[PDB]
Amino acid sequence: HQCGLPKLMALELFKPFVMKRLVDLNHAQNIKSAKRMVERQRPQVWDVLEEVIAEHPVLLNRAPTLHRLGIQAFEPMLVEGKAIQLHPLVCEAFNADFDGDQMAVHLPLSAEAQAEARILMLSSNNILSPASGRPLAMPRLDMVTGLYYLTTEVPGDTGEYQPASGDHPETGVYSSPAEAIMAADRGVLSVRAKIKVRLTQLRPPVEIEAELFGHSGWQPGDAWMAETTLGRVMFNELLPLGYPFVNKQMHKKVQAAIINDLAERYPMIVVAQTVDKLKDAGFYWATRSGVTV
Amino acid sequence: AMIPFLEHDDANRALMGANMQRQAVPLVRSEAPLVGTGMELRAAIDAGDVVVAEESGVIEEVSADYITVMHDNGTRRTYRMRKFARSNHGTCANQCPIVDAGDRVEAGQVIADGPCTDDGEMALGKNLLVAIMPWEGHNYEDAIILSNRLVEEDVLTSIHIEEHEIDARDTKLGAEEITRDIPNISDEVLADLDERGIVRIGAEVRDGDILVGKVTPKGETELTPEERLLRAIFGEKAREVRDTSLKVPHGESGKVIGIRVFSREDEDELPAGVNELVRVYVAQKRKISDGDKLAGRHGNKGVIGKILPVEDMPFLADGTPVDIILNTHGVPRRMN
Amino acid sequence: ATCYGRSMATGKLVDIGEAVGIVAAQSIGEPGTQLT
Amino acid sequence: MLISQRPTLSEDVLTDNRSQFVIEPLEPGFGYTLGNSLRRTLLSSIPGAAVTSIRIDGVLHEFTTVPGVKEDVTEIILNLKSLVVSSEEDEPVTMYLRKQGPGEVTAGDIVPPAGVTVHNPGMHIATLNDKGKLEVELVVERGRGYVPAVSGAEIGRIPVDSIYSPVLKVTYKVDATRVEQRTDFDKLILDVETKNSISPRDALASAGKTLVELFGLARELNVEAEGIEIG
Amino acid sequence: ISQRPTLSEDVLTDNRSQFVIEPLEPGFGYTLGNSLRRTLLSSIPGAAVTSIRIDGVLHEFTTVPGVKEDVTEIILNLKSLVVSSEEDEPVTMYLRKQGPGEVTAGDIVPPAGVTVHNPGMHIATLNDKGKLEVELVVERGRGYVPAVQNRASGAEIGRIPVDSIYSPVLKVTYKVDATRVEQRTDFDKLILDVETKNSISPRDALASAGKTLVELFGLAR
Amino acid sequence: DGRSGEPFPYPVTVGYMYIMKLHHLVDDKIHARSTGPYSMITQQPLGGKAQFGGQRFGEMECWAMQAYGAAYTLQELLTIKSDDTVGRVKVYEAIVKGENIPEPGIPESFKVLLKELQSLCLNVEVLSSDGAAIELREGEDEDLERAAANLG
Amino acid sequence: GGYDTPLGITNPPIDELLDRVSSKYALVIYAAKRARQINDYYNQLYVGPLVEPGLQEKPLSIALREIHADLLEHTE
Amino acid sequence: WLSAASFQETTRVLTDAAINCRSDKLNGLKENVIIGKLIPAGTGINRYRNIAVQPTEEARAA
d(CA D22, CA F103): 46
β-strands B117-118, B121-122: how paired? antiparallel
Measured at the CA of G42, the angle between CA G37 and CA G45, to 5 degrees, comes to: 125
Q: What is chain B's alpha carbon radius of gyration, rounded to the nearest angstrom?
A: 27
User: Which residues 6+ apart lie within 8 Å of B40 measured at CB?
Assistant: B2, B32, B33, B121, B122, B123
Phi and psi dihedrals of A157, rounded to 5?
Answer: -70, 160
Report the largest interatomic distance among the alpha carbons of chain C, rounded to a whole angstrom.
36
> How far off is chain D from B137, nearest CA to CA, in Å?
15
If you measure CA to CA, which chain F residue comes closest to H45? F71
Listed in sequence order, the residues at least 6 apart from B38 whose beta carbon sits closer than 8 Å to its beta carbon are none
Q: What is the 8-class DSSP label of residue B8?
A: G
User: How far apart are the CA of E180 and the nearest CA of chain A, in angstroms?
Assistant: 10
Cis peptide before A64 (omega within 30 of 0): yes
Chains touching F (at least 3 CB pairs under 8 A) are: A, B, C, D, E, G, H
Look up residue E153 and give its amino acid. S
Q: Do H59 and G71 touch (CB under 8 A)?
A: yes
Which residues in chain A have their CB less than 8 angstroms from residue B9's CB?
none
Q: How far apart are CA F96 and CA F80, in angstroms?
A: 15
- What are the structural domains of chain D? 1-47+165-231 (3.30.1360.10), 48-164 (2.170.120.12)
Computed on alpha carbons and rounded to an integer, the radius of gyration of chain E in Å comes to 22
CA angle E109, E115, E117 (to 5 degrees): 105
- Whole-angstrom distance, CA of residue H30 vs CA of residue H24: 12
Q: Is B219 exposed, middle or buried (0-12, 13-18, 19+ CB in 10 A)?
A: exposed
Contact call for residues A190 and A159 (beta carbons, < 8 A): yes
The distance from CA F32 to its chain's CA centroid, rounded to whole angstroms, is: 12
Nearest to B252 by CA among B164, B154, B148: B164
| CA–CA gap between residue G20 and residue G36 (Å, rounded) | 20
Annotated domain spans of chain G:
1-76
Choose the mutation target among A80, A186, A189 for the interface with E, i.e. most E CBs under 10 Å: A186
Beta pairing partners, B91: B160
Closest CA to B254 of B38, B21, B84, B126: B84
Give the residue from H39, H46, H49 with the most F CB atoms within 10 Å of its CB, the best one to mutate: H39
> What Å distances lie between residue B13 and B292, B333, F24, CA to CA?
20, 11, 18
Provide the 10 A C-beta neighbour count for residue F86.
16
The DSSP output letter for B199 is: B
Helical residues (DSSP H) of chain D, grouped into ranges: 30-44, 73-81, 200-219
Using a CB-CB cut-off of 8 Å, the residues of chain H touching G73 are: 53-56
3-state secondary structure of F28: helix
Angle A268-287/A252-265 helices, nearest 10 degrees?
160
Give yes or no for a contact between D140 and D91, defined as CB atoms under 8 angstroms apart.
no
Residue H47 burial by Cβ neighbours in a 10 Å radius (0-12, 13-18, 19+): middle
The nearest alpha carbon in chain F to D172 belongs to F4
Closest by Cα among D145, D95, D136, D137 to D117:
D95
Contact H28, H45 (CB under 8 A): no
DSSP B264-280: TTTT----TTEEEEEEE
Ramachandran category for residue B262: left, alpha or beta (phi over 0 → left; psi -120 to 50 → alpha): beta
DSSP string, A181-206: HHHHHTTT--TTSEEEEEESSSB--H
Strand partners, A48: none
Element (H, E) at A233: helix A230-236
Bond before A205 cis per omega within 30 degrees = no
- Partners of D161 on chain A (C-beta within 8 Å) are 174, 179, 183
State which H helix or E strand residue B149 sits in: helix B149-152
How many angstroms separate the CA of residue A223 from the nearest CA in chain B? 34
Tell me the three state secondary structure of residue A102: coil
Chain A residues with CB-CB distance to D165 below 8 A: 182
Beta strand A173-174 pairing with A194-199: parallel
The 3-state DSSP class for residue G55 equals coil
Closest CA to B274 of B179, B196, B171, B170: B170
Identify the burial level of A264 via C-beta atoms within 10 angstroms of its C-beta, where 0-12 means exposed, 13-18 middle and 19 or more buried.
Answer: exposed
Taking contacts as CB-CB distances below 8 angstroms, the residues of chain F near A119 are none
Q: What are the phi and psi torsion angles at D120 (to 5°)?
A: -125, 70
Nearest residue to D174 (alpha-carbon basis) of D8, D42, D40, D23: D23
Look at A131 and C11 and tell me if their CB atoms are within 8 Å. Answer: no
Chains that touch A (3 or more CB pairs under 8 A): B, C, D, E, F, G, H
Can you name the residues that pair with B199 across neighbouring β-strands? B193
In the beta sheet, which residues pair with residue A11? none
Nearest to A80 by CA among B309, B255, F5, D188: B309
Q: For residue A97, how many other CB atoms are within 10 A of its CB?
A: 14
**DSSP at E107:** G
| C17 with H29: Cβ contact below 8 A | no
Is the separation of the CB atoms in B276 and B198 below 8 Å?
no
Classify residue H44 by its DSSP letter. G
Residue A143 phi, psi (nearest 5): -50, -55
Distances (CA, A) of B25 to B91, B198, B274, F22: 7, 30, 36, 6
Per-residue DSSP letter, H50: S
Phi/psi of residue D208, each to 5°?
A: -60, -45
SS3 for E50-72, per residue? EEEEECCCCCCCCCCCCECCCHH
Beta bridge partners of D98: D135
Under 8 Å between Cβ of D228 and E14: no
Which one of A41, A48, A175, A233 would you mutate to disrupt binding with D, by most D Cβ within 10 Å of its Cβ? Answer: A175
Query: DSSP letter at D204?
Result: H
Separation between Cα atoms, residue B291 and residue B303, nearest integer Å: 5
Check CB contact of D36 with chain F, cutoff 8 Å: yes
Residues sharing a CB contact under 8 Å with residue D153, sequence separation 6 or more, in sequence order: none
What is chain A's Cα-based Rg? Answer: 25
Return all residues near B240 (Cβ < 8 A) that are at least 6 apart: B217, B218, B219, B220, B222, B223, B231
Q: Is-contact B115 B26, C-beta < 8 A?
A: yes
G4 touches chain A (CB under 8 A): yes
- D63 at interface of B, judged by CB pairs closer than 8 A: no
Helix (H, G, I), strand (E, B) or coil at E173: strand
Tell me, in Å, the resolution of the deposited structure: 2.8
Sign of the Cα pseudo-torsion (D218, D223, D228, E3, in order): positive
Cα–Cα distance between A116 and A129 in angstroms, integer?
Answer: 19
Q: Which residues contact residue B183 at a Cβ distance below 8 angstroms, ignoring those fewer than 6 apart?
A: B215, B241, B243
Give the CA count within 13 Å in the CB-facing half-sphere of H29: 27
| Residue D92: exposure state from Cβ atoms within 10 A (0-12, 13-18, ≥19) | exposed
| Residues 6+ away with beta carbon under 8 Å from A256 | A134, A135, A138
Burial of D228 (0-12, 13-18, 19+ CB in 10 A): middle
**Who's near F116: CB < 8 A, 6+ residues apart?**
none
